[PDB]
Design a protein around this ligand. Sequence first.
Ligand SMILES: *Cc1c(COP(=O)(O)O)cnc(C)c1O
Ligand SMILES: *Cc1c(COP(=O)(O)O)cnc(C)c1O
Lengths: 359, 358
Amino acid sequence: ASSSFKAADLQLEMTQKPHKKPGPGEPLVFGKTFTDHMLMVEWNDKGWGQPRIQPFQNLTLHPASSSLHYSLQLFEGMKAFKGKDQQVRLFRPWLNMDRMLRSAMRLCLPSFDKLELLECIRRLIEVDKDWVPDAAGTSLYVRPVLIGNEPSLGVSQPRRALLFVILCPVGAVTPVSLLADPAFIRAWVGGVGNYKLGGNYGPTVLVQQEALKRGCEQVLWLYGPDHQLTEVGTMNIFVYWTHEDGVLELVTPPLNGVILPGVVRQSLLDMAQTWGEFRVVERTITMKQLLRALEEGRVREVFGSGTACQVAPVHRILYKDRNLHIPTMENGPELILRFQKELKEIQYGIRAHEWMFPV
Amino acid sequence: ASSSFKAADLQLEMTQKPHKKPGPGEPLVFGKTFTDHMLMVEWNDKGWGQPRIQPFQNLTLHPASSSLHYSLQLFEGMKAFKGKDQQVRLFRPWLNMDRMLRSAMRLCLPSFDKLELLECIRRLIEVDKDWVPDAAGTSLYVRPVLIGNEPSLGVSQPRRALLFVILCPVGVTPVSLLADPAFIRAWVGGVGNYKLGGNYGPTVLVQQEALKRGCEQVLWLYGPDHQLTEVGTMNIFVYWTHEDGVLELVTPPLNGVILPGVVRQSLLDMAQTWGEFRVVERTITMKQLLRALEEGRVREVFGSGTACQVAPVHRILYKDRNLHIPTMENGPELILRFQKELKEIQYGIRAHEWMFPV
Ligand SMILES: *Cc1c(COP(=O)(O)O)cnc(C)c1O
Ligand SMILES: *Cc1c(COP(=O)(O)O)cnc(C)c1O
C-alpha cells in the first residue's frame, strides 16, 4: 500500500530547451511564471513508483479522473529564499510536509515519507537554482500537489494518484480593506477548513468578487452567532492590542477546526513568545470585542499572515454597513515591521536559524 | 462566441478505434465503462469556442490548472433511457441544465446557453446510440463537467475553462445507514446546495467509516437537533403519519444544506398531483423519527437520486443502537408506485412532457 518513494531512486531528465528567465528589474506576478523542471511521482495499488525530475510539461489525465469530479486534490505552499551568498534556503519545510500528509490522509490519498519528499524537492530546487531570485522582497514559491487519479466515476478511495511539485519565482507593507459579512462561511467545526484542500478555495472566488463590488479588497471570514474573526482571505488573522484587563497582547484565533494551521502564524507566535515583551495567546476574537477596543483606542495593529503576502496590514473593515477604521499604519506599524525585519533576516540568511533548510 | 457556443457550429470526429462494448456483459458497474465519444468545448476571455464531438481521449492540462489546485469544478448527472421502440429519451434534462448553470455562476465559471448544451449532448448520445442498453433497470448515465483551466496559481476568476461530457452505460434493494452527528456534509452559508466537486472528496473517509461500522451508506445529520439531511449522495424522504394524525410525505427544505435533486422534485410533483396525502418540505429530526418509530407511525423512508433512483432504508445506526425502519414491511407501497410511474415515463410506455427524445 504505502512503502514510500525514495530520493535515492530519483531519476533526472534535464530540459533540452531552457525557458526565458524574467531578468533583473522585471515584475514577477504571483504564480504566472514557471521554472524549467517539475517533480513527478505516480502511485497505484502496487505502491509508489520512482520519483522523477522531468521538464515542465502538461499532465495527461483520464476524463473520469477523481481529481476533476470529486476534488480529490490538495496542495501546499512554501517559499525558498536566495541570499547575497547565492545559497538557497527553504522556510520551515518540515511543517508543510506535516500538513501535506494530514491533508492526504483526510482525502484517503496515499501516505508518503515526509523526509523523502523534502529531499526530492530540495533536489528539484537545486536543478532550478538559477531561477531563484536574490533581490529584496523576492523568492521562489514552491507548490507541491497530490491528486487522486482514479479513471472511474464512483465516489471512493482512489486506486491511483499523482504527486507533483511546480516552482514559481515571485517578486516584491501595503494596507488592505476587508468586507465582514456574516452570510459567507468559509469553514465549519467538524469540516475541512483546517486542511489545505482545493475544495476550500473555489467557492471563495465569488465572495472575493462581492468584496470588490462593495469597495473592499479582501474578505474577513466571520463564524458563529457572536461573529468570531477567523481568517482574512487566505491568511491567518492577528490582533495586537491592550486587552480588556489592561495588558498588552498579541492574539490569534485557536486551532479548533475552522482555522488553517499556518506556518507563518506558528512562526509569529514562536518569535513573539521568545521576546517576552507582551502576552501571546490563542483565543477567540469577536466583532464586539474588536468594536469596543476600537472606540476605546486600545487597538494598535490588525494583520494577516501567510506565505504569499508574509504579513499584510489591515486599515479598514466594512461591517453592518459601517466603515471601521483600524489604526494599523498609524501605529508604525511597529510590530509588523519588526516581524518583517526578523523574518527577512532569517529567510535571507543574515541570521542563522534552525527554521531554514539549505539546498 | 460573444455569449455562448452554438450546436450549429458542432464539429464531429468519429473514432478510428472503437473499444470493447458489453454483452449484456453481466456486471455493468457504475462509472467504469465509457462510450466511444465525448463532447468538448473550450472558453477563454474572448468567448466560447466551437463545440466538438471527438473520440474518448485523455485531457491535456497545464500543471497550474485552477481545476486541480482550487477545485474550480462542477458536474452533473442525468440518465438516458432506451424504450421498447428503440427510441432513446433523456429524463427532465432542462432541470439539470438549470442546475449546471447555477453551479457555474457560483464558481465564477462561464455562462452558456442551456438549450445549446442540451442539443450538443443530444447529438453526442445520438453518435453513441448503440451504447444505450435496453434491458429493464439499465440506462446511459450522462456526465457533464465544467472546469476552470487557468494556468496560474492565484485564487481568482478563471480566464480559461473547459466543458466536457462523457457517457457511461449503467445497470428494490434496501440499505443500512450510519447516523453520527460528528460528520457534517454541508453548512448554512456554504455550498452543499450546488453540485461542485469540493462537496464530495471529504466524504470518502466518512463512507469508509460507515463500511467499517457495518453500514452501507451515510445518513448526513446537521445541527444540535440532528436533522436528517441527505442519504449518501441522495435526497431523503419520510412517509409517515405525522403527530397531528395526517398521513404525509416529507423531505428537508432547500435552506442551504440540501442539493435540489431532479428526482426529488419529480417525486414532489407526482405526489402533489395525486392529492391522496399531504406533501411538504420541512426539517426532520432524529427525535421525531424515534418518536414515530416507537408509536408505529413510520411507513417508509427512502433516498432519491439519478443513480439508484429510489433506494429503501431498513436500518439506521444511531447512538450505537440499531433502529429498524419498517420500509419493507409496508410494501414498500409508495416506493413501488413511484418506481412504476417513473418506469412508464422513462421507457416510453406513456407519453410525457418530462422526456426529451434523442
Ligand atoms: C495557506 C493558508 C494560510 C497560511 O498558511 P501559511 O502556511 O502560513 O502559508 C492561512 N489560511 C488559509 C485559509 C490558507 O489557505
Ligand atoms: C446528485 C445529488 C442528489 C440527487 O440529485 P438528482 O438530480 O436527483 O440526481 C442529491 N444529493 C446530493 C448530495 C447529490 O450530489
